[PDB]
Amino acid sequence: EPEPQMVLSPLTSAAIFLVVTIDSGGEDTVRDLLSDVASLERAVGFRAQPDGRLSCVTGIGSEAWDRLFSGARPAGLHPFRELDGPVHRAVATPGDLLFHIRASRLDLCFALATEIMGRLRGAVTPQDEVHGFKYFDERDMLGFVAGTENPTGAAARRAVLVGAEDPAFAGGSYAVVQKYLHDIDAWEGLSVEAQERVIGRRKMTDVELSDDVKPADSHVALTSVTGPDGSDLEILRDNMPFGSVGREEFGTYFIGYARTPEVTETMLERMFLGTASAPHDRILDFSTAVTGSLFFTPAADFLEDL
Amino acid sequence: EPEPQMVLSPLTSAAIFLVVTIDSGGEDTVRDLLSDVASLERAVGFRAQPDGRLSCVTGIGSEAWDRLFSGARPAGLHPFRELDGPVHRAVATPGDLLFHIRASRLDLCFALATEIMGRLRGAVTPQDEVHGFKYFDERDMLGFVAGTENPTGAAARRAVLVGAEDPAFAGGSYAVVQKYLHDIDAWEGLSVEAQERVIGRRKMTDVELSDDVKPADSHVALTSVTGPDGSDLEILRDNMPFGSVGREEFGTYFIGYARTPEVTETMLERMFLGTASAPHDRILDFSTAVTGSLFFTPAADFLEDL
Amino acid sequence: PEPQMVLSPLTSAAIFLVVTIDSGGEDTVRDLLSDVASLERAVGFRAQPDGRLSCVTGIGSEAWDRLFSGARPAGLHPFRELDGPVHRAVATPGDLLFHIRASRLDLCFALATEIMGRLRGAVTPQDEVHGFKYFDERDMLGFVAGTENPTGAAARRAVLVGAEDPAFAGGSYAVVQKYLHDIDAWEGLSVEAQERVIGRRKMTDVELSDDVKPADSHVALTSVTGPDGSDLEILRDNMPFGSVGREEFGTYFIGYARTPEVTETMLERMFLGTASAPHDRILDFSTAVTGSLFFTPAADFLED
Amino acid sequence: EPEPQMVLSPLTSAAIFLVVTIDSGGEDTVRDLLSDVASLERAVGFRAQPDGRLSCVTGIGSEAWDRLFSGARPAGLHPFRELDGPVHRAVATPGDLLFHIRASRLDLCFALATEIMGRLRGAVTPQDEVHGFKYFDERDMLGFVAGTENPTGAAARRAVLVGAEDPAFAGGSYAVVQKYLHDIDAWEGLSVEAQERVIGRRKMTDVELSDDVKPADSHVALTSVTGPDGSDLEILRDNMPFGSVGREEFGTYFIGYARTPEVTETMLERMFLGTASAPHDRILDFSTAVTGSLFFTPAADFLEDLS
Amino acid sequence: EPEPQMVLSPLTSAAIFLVVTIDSGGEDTVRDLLSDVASLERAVGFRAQPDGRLSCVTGIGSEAWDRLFSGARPAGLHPFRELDGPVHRAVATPGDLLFHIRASRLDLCFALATEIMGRLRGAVTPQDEVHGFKYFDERDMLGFVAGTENPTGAAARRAVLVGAEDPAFAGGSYAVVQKYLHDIDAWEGLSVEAQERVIGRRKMTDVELSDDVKPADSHVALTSVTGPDGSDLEILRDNMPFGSVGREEFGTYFIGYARTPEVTETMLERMFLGTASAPHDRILDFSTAVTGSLFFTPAADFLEDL
Amino acid sequence: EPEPQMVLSPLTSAAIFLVVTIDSGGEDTVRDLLSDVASLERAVGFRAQPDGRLSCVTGIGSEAWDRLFSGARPAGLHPFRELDGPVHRAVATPGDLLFHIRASRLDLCFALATEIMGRLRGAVTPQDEVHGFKYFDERDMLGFVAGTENPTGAAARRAVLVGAEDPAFAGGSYAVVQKYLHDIDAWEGLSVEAQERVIGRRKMTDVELSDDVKPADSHVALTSVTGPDGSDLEILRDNMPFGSVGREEFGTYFIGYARTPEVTETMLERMFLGTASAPHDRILDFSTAVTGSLFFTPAADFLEDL
Ligand code: HEM
Ligand code: HEM
Ligand code: HEM
Ligand code: HEM
Ligand SMILES: [Mg+2]
Ligand SMILES: [Mg+2]
Ligand SMILES: [Mg+2]
Ligand SMILES: [O]
Ligand SMILES: [O]
Ligand SMILES: [O]
Ligand SMILES: [O]
Ligand SMILES: [O]
Ligand SMILES: [O]
């Protein structure tokens, strides 16, 4: 059986998201780090157990894949597709490696990020570094409970992990990242009732709006997708608030894991391009994407045997 | 008896330090915020009891004091004194207001900082914003336990709180801040034994080096000071690690509270200018001050009664 | 097939809600059943992961016929009243059971509020009990309660419907009885006399050896061996409850099993006695004031 | 410095409020129990240290005081004063003894309530019993954070504990209890902003409404009282949610401690009878008081030195 | 004004009791260690703040006091008084220094005991070392709750701390230690009701037996003492269970703190020699004392100034 | 189908290791206790759910197996093999039964140990009893993190549990125990860099030394073993510190679970007898084995069905 990376792990109160590009001739240094990254995770995390809950998920971009490895490519791997909607745009930004670092404490994230970047100095250029913090009541930067409808157990495994459709990369997953900045002044001008119509859930109680009152351009309505079979298409999201009060930056770092990028890309199409019944997702009237990248997160044993 | 701010409260795992200057015409907006800051601390923190441990200490600079208030000035309040040592410099940087925000979680610090800065928008200019995190084993950025010789109980109250020497300001304190960036590459080039001789304590066990072994130019030696009366002069320090792995920023945010700035200033003179037996504090060969500001943190009732 | 949380452990808080379905309330009920997993997530996610909020939903025999056409679960019937020589196990009305558990009563109450809010005008409440953990997993008699519950594979085998009734695999049967205790009479016994009623040591919870365990002890009468000589097991989530002012010191009994026959055999031995035992001596200190039987379907049965 | 009961202690996650009346001839049994109540609290609580946080505050009503004790009365002790407003009524209901029991767990509350009621069986009649629970982030059944502006440290000591004004009773306090039931159907028909105008604080973030927007008939406006010298008059509230989903009971158990009942009573007069600017507290349009009792909670040493 | 050691602090889940004798010529080494013990306590304890709750109380015996110090002695400091009852004996055993180490975790106790014994190697001989542990709900090896009637708050300060009756030694206290082994076989031969008549409290619920059923020879009856003026004479007990299952050793380590040894010794006389109404404390029919030592625990500042 | 004992369970903060020999005629009493040990575990542990995490793993020695049972032996069961190296010796010491008792608290361990030994009194003779405790951030007495490279999940199950190679004993495991005492004086004389060369990892950060600097006689180098097929051969180690400060006993209690003893024995051979490039494991220059025993820990249902 192939060992997945910790893609199925739950939300934690802290995260570091590190996106880098591989400099010309940095390939060899990168391959050596990838073969050690699970051992670095154990080195930093084991002594802080059991409360630490440290994990690192490592992702590799479409272009970087061709630079690093000969042989088969994962079937779903391609650069992030820019979406030019009538009003809102999903931008594509450079990204060769993702490190999705989670723990109960920011210091354990930082210590692992320090060892990884120590090994990669002179081989990579940092593109994005975000320090995420969840609110103590599981709320995001808009004041809503975040993660409620994430799949669990066998449903999560089936939605997130590559299987027989691409057997050489079984136990892998696809990660889409987008850094969003919010217009908090505009958001806080809405009544609570208006905010609930944007999201599609009650703010205090987190109960879903019933189908007769849920607007067709609510976040929950547009990111609800049924397959040909009639079955719900699901992703696993580990979204984190981040910000700087001095710079008035109040953000959500979106990360969504799926067995194929087509599920996440369908949701993004419905959000940015809309449908017959909805011009666009009302959350984008308060949220601007400033990054967008797609990564393949291989099985742990693929990184180890390299 | 006057009610002090939470200057005596213990170290926490998260902090936000905010330093701002007051723009032209900003004084009325600032006075309104000062009269409300304790009530905002309760609004953000109460619902997160008892695990939240949210506090805010508010400080006011020498020039800002004269802009905001008529009548008496605290006896020790003056702008930070630059020290131009033969090798190392303690710089002065602008700062009218300090908010020293502590909690068990960064998101609680961030929520109070958001409310404070929301009320000050258009009246202030941000000078500095640092998000602090302690390592899970009470270690600083240099790998040493930080806080060990802080005073506690009655000795802390005597060391930190203004009393009858300045009775109109009793229950106040003086805060000096300095942001330090470390040369971690040079520090990690030392053996553990050489680092212990820089600090003056054992790294793993935190046991102080004996007087026979402890170098005259160690941090513990130079920051150990006796008054004319033979008594130890003590300050309370809430130093926090901070940084950015992508930018290679690895820092210690120094904050020290004391009943009179003369004690903190004497320690800084010994570190930066040295003594007969030591050229300077050896910690400064690995640590560059990039900010320096002095604040008076009044009694809580002083701020309430505006 | 995915079961409801019938295999989940004891928690420190619980709400037990039993209602009857009023005439014409069927459609409101079916809509709520299709939504109960989503309500559970909605309330529970506000306290992940320590909250441990779950709701197990059960349906009575008469309600089943009012709600669904086609196949019945093989073991579903109304609770069988037992009229013993001394003690009686009463059958009381109940169409729906909500077995709500969490680490905190707030999560239980918030979920109960949303469920009952959705069913207002469609159901009549019959029983509501707010259970709480009592010291080191003790009951109102001062004994540790749950010790011999099966775990892991033995729990799955004992609790979940399998191939014997394949349309309903991953279901279970719940029996509930609210008991009120005579604490005055109980505290009149020596600790040694109480140990002989239960069949375990009071402070240390060690089982009495077979040579000393009375045949009419609770542990002896509820020990049943199946055709192959293996133990027939149930999973019990008993919770203390009460009201000091009204002198109500209670045990809310709930037992899950793959077939009701196992639980019913245990109840027959307790209430009717055997050749060796007049009745379960625990009943000399405990009166059953409710009795109901429910089928707790697979989670997938409810969503569909 | 005489030793107070645990009146200054913080909110906990569980509580039992027990109100009883003393039957004729029950006085000797009650005095005996009062002399033992601190020892019973230690007997239950000590084995759950350090996390248990079990405490019991024992209060005695005006008429019970006269039956139990032959000497001096606390200066402020009198029966609860019924308030007959143009719209709303604050009823006075019987209660001789209050047990305010708090812990981090209901089991410790229940076990201590069991031991106390076991000692008083046949001497007292139960009037009210409420099992309170913390609801999410210190919320009440109206969805608002409750307790935010409670005084702390020295301010709490000054606001709550009897001192030199009544020296024989120094370290005592005065507790007012009211059981409120809420009309949740009517409450949930308001917009969140209309709820915020009833309470005077933001619902989700618990920030006080600015003075320009805070209505005069908001809860926070009517329960804000200044003394003649301009300083705030404060009380310490340990309010707890309770209820029963089947019976549609969604309750707030109000308890307020103060150094003199005059402060709590001035707040109640403003709520129920209103001011020049406000007819009544808008919170009462959604809240009905069904009990009302006043108790003196003596210093701990006063109870210990009985017979 | 004088700062007591942590004699008033509550029970913890772990303790180490270390009793040593001072070798001939060990006096100087011992004096240097005593002046450093508070600094060693902070060095170990600070890196587990705030849940560690590490503390060390240092006690000095009567014969050791006269070897270490000159001038005035604490008024009540004498060797433990052997009690030769008709049936039961309280033995006196050697001991010059007591280290009473408590924390929430054994590791912090063990690390501090290691640093102390490292400084004293070749100057002292170990007489007794006991690792204590919390047993369920504050129970002892007899199955009863132990510590229930300890004084708290002001009553504890008044019972425990030397004051104006011996002003030079204000802030000190007197510790009596006795290691007890229990005859568990004999004890378990009693019914629970017989055990309750030995102790004087209910076993499961820890409710005191009423005055009309409490035997005169029960432990609670003989250890209840009133002064000539009617007030209760109280001690503070920090008893801890210990044992070794292989050796069939089930113990109680008794430690009682009091402002004068006369209170503790009056209790011991009643237990071992009895009263007019009681031959001896029935708890002694199931408990054997194998050590007995008395120590003065000076104010913290007395040790620091050496 | 067969239910293993709790061999795969994680490290806990407390342990008791009990090794006994079966006295002549004690066989019938032992068989009765083996059939009840799981019942005793529930009796003590249930009341402390869910935080207690009490488990007992019961092991039987080679000589004991033939005294207790008729019919098939586990294929790998033999007496511990004494290793007589040029410098260091791995002694074989008597042991018929192992009880490996773990929990989050020592009380639960002690209570279960008391019930087991109460049933075995007069049938067994105790050989060793060790009370283990967690030391800071999962450290051993040498000050290094211990457990870091233990296998987890599927890799742990594959490394530890007997499968189809010995189908009658599927779900069993083999436990090797060795009690080590450390020369802390000699160890603490080494610089941290020289200690790192003994172990093969960085002391404070627990990062593995790179292959270019790791000495061939380091602990990590000698306990790293590859099968003929190139895979890593793994064991599960649940090592616990123990000690007594007055007796200068600073111990590591070694316990290693494996699907076959040949893996553990290959590691011991390399440590004690060395390789072409290493005389012996340098850790043995600071560590003396004083016990050595091998046990088969059967499937839980094997014990239940006696
Ligand atoms: C500013 C960015 C975002 C914010 C603040 C945000 C917030 C939320 C919230 C509050 C919910 C409801 C509770 C939950 O189930 O987590 C939700 C649901 C969801 N979001 Fe987002 N979201 C954002 C971006 C995205 C993006 C970019 C996607 C997909 C590409 C996405 C996919 C989903 C999905 C699939 C659900 C679950 C819908 C359901 O089936 O109920 N979100 N989000
Ligand atoms: C530049 C970055 C700094 C770092 C990384 C640092 C770190 C440390 C460490 C590790 C200790 C030993 C443990 C303890 O906290 O007692 C210490 C002690 C101390 N530091 Fe700093 N420190 C810094 C700057 C300062 C400054 C600027 C001052 C004063 C103006 C200061 C004053 C002290 C004092 C008074 C002590 C206690 C010494 C004693 O009496 O034992 N430190 N510091
Ligand atoms: C007054 C109501 C009850 C009380 C207070 C009570 C209490 C207990 C206690 C203290 C135990 C021993 C520890 C353990 O849980 O294994 C026990 C065991 C048990 N009880 Fe009950 N019980 C009650 C009613 C029932 C009922 C109504 C049934 C069955 C229909 C039942 C079935 C069992 C079973 C099967 C065991 C396990 C026996 C074994 O195999 O060891 N109980 N109960
Ligand atoms: C249905 C009954 C009640 C409910 C739901 C309720 C709820 C609240 C809420 C939500 C607050 C705002 C947060 C805070 O606690 O500071 C508050 C404040 C307060 N309440 Fe109540 N309350 C009730 C009855 C009472 C009564 C009867 C009194 C006095 C007799 C009282 C006195 C106060 C006071 C003094 C404040 C603080 C006002 C300030 O200075 O800001 N409340 N209450
Ligand atoms: Mg009978
Ligand atoms: Mg206020
Ligand atoms: Mg014996
Ligand atoms: O999301
Ligand atoms: O510092
Ligand atoms: O049960
Ligand atoms: O309130
Ligand atoms: O004691
Ligand atoms: O190891």
Residue numbers in the entry:
A (entry chain B), B (entry chain E), E (entry chain A), F (entry chain C): 7 to 312
C (entry chain D): 8 to 311
D (entry chain F): 7 to 313
From the paper:
The RT-SFX DtpB ferric and Compound I structures revealed that the distal heme pocket, which is composed of an Asp–Arg–Asn triad, was void of H2O molecules.
Therefore, based on the D152A variant being the only variant having a Compound I species stable for >15 min, the ferric microcrystals of this variant were subjected to RT-SFX measurement following soaking with H2O2. Data collection and refinement statistics of the H2O2-soaked structure determined at 1.90 Å resolution are reported in Tables S1 and S2, respectively. The structure reveals that w2 and w3 remain present, with no new H2O molecule observed. An electron density peak is observed directly above the heme–Fe in each monomer of the hexamer assembly. However, owing to the longer Fe–O bond length, we are cautious to claim this structure as a “pure” Compound I species, where Fe–O bond lengths of between 1.63 and 1.73 Å are expected. The longer time scale for the extruder measurements may allow some decay of Compound I (see the kinetics of Compound I reduction below). A further point of note is that a wet site creates an additional H-bond donor to the oxo group.
